[PDB]
Scaffold this active site. Structure first.
Site, PDB file in Angstrom:
ATOM      1  N   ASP A  88     -52.291 -27.444  15.582  1.00  0.00           N
ATOM      2  CA  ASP A  88     -52.254 -26.982  16.975  1.00  0.00           C
ATOM      3  C   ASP A  88     -52.547 -28.035  18.038  1.00  0.00           C
ATOM      4  O   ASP A  88     -53.299 -27.785  18.975  1.00  0.00           O
ATOM      5  CB  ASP A  88     -53.191 -25.779  17.153  1.00  0.00           C
ATOM      6  CG  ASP A  88     -52.549 -24.634  17.929  1.00  0.00           C
ATOM      7  OD1 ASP A  88     -51.333 -24.691  18.213  1.00  0.00           O
ATOM      8  OD2 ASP A  88     -53.268 -23.665  18.253  1.00  0.00           O
TER       9      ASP A  88
ATOM     10  N   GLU B 282     -46.637 -30.155  18.422  1.00  0.00           N
ATOM     11  CA  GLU B 282     -46.883 -28.805  18.876  1.00  0.00           C
ATOM     12  C   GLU B 282     -46.271 -28.646  20.254  1.00  0.00           C
ATOM     13  O   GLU B 282     -45.419 -29.438  20.636  1.00  0.00           O
ATOM     14  CB  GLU B 282     -48.362 -28.445  18.864  1.00  0.00           C
ATOM     15  CG  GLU B 282     -48.661 -27.344  17.876  1.00  0.00           C
ATOM     16  CD  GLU B 282     -47.802 -26.106  18.086  1.00  0.00           C
ATOM     17  OE1 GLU B 282     -47.953 -25.400  19.109  1.00  0.00           O
ATOM     18  OE2 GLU B 282     -46.969 -25.826  17.211  1.00  0.00           O
TER      19      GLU B 282
ATOM     20  N   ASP C 198     -48.433 -23.900  25.977  1.00  0.00           N
ATOM     21  CA  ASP C 198     -48.534 -22.601  25.323  1.00  0.00           C
ATOM     22  C   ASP C 198     -49.461 -21.699  26.126  1.00  0.00           C
ATOM     23  O   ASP C 198     -50.501 -22.140  26.588  1.00  0.00           O
ATOM     24  CB  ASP C 198     -49.070 -22.759  23.896  1.00  0.00           C
ATOM     25  CG  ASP C 198     -47.966 -23.005  22.870  1.00  0.00           C
ATOM     26  OD1 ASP C 198     -46.772 -22.932  23.216  1.00  0.00           O
ATOM     27  OD2 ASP C 198     -48.294 -23.254  21.695  1.00  0.00           O
TER      28      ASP C 198
ATOM     29  N   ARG D 270     -37.881 -22.323  23.738  1.00  0.00           N
ATOM     30  CA  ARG D 270     -39.052 -21.678  24.327  1.00  0.00           C
ATOM     31  C   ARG D 270     -39.320 -22.089  25.770  1.00  0.00           C
ATOM     32  O   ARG D 270     -40.313 -22.770  26.051  1.00  0.00           O
ATOM     33  CB  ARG D 270     -40.290 -21.926  23.465  1.00  0.00           C
ATOM     34  CG  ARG D 270     -40.061 -21.674  22.004  1.00  0.00           C
ATOM     35  CD  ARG D 270     -41.361 -21.670  21.278  1.00  0.00           C
ATOM     36  NE  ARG D 270     -41.170 -21.386  19.868  1.00  0.00           N
ATOM     37  CZ  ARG D 270     -42.138 -21.454  18.961  1.00  0.00           C
ATOM     38  NH1 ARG D 270     -43.372 -21.800  19.321  1.00  0.00           N
ATOM     39  NH2 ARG D 270     -41.867 -21.188  17.690  1.00  0.00           N
TER      40      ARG D 270
HETATM   41 CA   LIG Z   1     -49.770 -24.194  20.084  1.00  0.00          CA
END
Ligand SMILES: [Ca+2]
EC number: 4.2.2.2
Length: 352
Positions: free
Chosen positions: A129, A166, A170, A218
């Site tokens: 992450d 990553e 987010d 995304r």
């Molecule tokens: Ca992430």
């Protein structure tokens, strides 16, 4: 002023009583935030003791340049990041012109956080992450005028063949109001979530004046809630763009799409398709697809593409003030306003 041109309304650390601090390294930022939790008597204060405006002057180009030259060696390294956890007093992290970071900013259960003028790239720890920016359970956050980048590539043998790097920004949990604006995001495979799972739905997010280039997908991967995407420049999208899922609603207005595959779609769930309201984009009808190299692909599961380029739902009255320039103007001018070293300049119709 708390005006971000989107759902988030915050001044960050630029409030009354703000304490200015200079951070020369990642470690300084951590120490400064830690000290900002102590009152006059040295006792900790829940949510922070005073507001902060942290100017980061560090430069980690060496780390970034070494990473770029060996992109597949990044995913297995330890992730690097500054965590802003439960700090509600108001904080602004702004990079000095020329600064750079090979670490991310992870916001957790905080509010009124502003991150500006930061150049973050090629972060280690994709398998653990290593996000450039993560907003989790944090309302009123403004991510503005930053350059977030890596390589739009997937190395062989990474966990889930999806962890070379990553994400850029987010967003998940109760991050109820967020504004992502004037960012130059390039060379990123997974730009950013809007909900960590099918059940993590909601939030009101505004993406405006961002310049995306060579990104796979995304933009965002939306789950429920509202997304207002205006005045963004989307070029070289190699997978899909706005993926409106779990009944989310999106208002896509006055954006410029070019050389993009599946720019607006709802796929991967096979159900509960989101909706979009299209207006003022450089694309006005399917005839323009060929003019701007818009490509569409199917999916193994039921999906909905905007190949008809028509609105498929509605959108509530936009709760804030904003004035978009034309899609042509974002194409012509946006690159000079997005990112770092632009002195946080904003594109107004006056400059069109
Ligand atoms: Ca992430």
């Amino acid at each position: 002023a708390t005006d971000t041109g989107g759902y988030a309304a915050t001044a960050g650390g630029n409030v009354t009583g703000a304490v200015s601090k200079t951070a020369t390294s990642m470690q300084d930022i951590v120490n400064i935030i830690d000290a900002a939790r102590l009152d006059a008597n040295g006792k900790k204060v829940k949510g922070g003791a005073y507001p902060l405006v942290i100017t980061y002057t560090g430069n980690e180009d060496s780390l970034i340049n070494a990473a770029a030259a060996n992109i597949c060696g990044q995913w297995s390294k330890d992730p690097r990041g500054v965590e802003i956890k439960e700090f509600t007093k108001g904080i602004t992290i702004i990079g000095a012109n020329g600064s750079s970071a090979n670490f991310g900013i992870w916001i957790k259960k905080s509010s009124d956080v502003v991150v500006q003028n930061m150049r973050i790239g090629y972060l280690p720890g994709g398998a653990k992450d290593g996000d450039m920016i993560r907003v989790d359970d944090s309302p009123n956050v403004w991510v503005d005028h930053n350059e977030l980048f890596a390589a739009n590539h997937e190395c062989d043998g990474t966990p889930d063949n999806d962890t070379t790097f990553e994400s850029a920004v987010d967003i998940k949990g109760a991050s109820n109001t967020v504004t992502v604006s004037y960012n130059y995001i390039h060379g990123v495979k997974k730009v950013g979530l809007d909900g960590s799972s099918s059940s993590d739905t909601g939030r009101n997010i505004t993406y405006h004046h961002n310049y995306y280039n060579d990104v796979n997908a995304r933009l965002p991967l939306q789950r429920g809630g509202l997304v207002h995407a205006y005045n963004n420049l989307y070029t070289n999208i190699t997978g899909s763009g706005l993926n409106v899922r779990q009944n989310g609603q999106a208002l896509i207005e006055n954006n410029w799409f070019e050389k993009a595959i599946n720019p607006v779609t709802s796929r991967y769930d096979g159900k509960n398709f989101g909706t979009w309201v299209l207006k003022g984009n450089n694309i006005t009808k399917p005839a323009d697809f060929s003019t701007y190299s818009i490509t569409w692909t199917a999916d193994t599961k039921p999906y909905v593409n905007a190949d008809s380029w028509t609105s498929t739902g509605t959108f509530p009255t936009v709760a804030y003030n904003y004035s978009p320039v034309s899609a042509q103007c974002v194409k012509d001018k946006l690159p000079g306003y997005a990112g770092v070293g632009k002195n946080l300049a904003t594109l107004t119709s006056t400059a069109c």
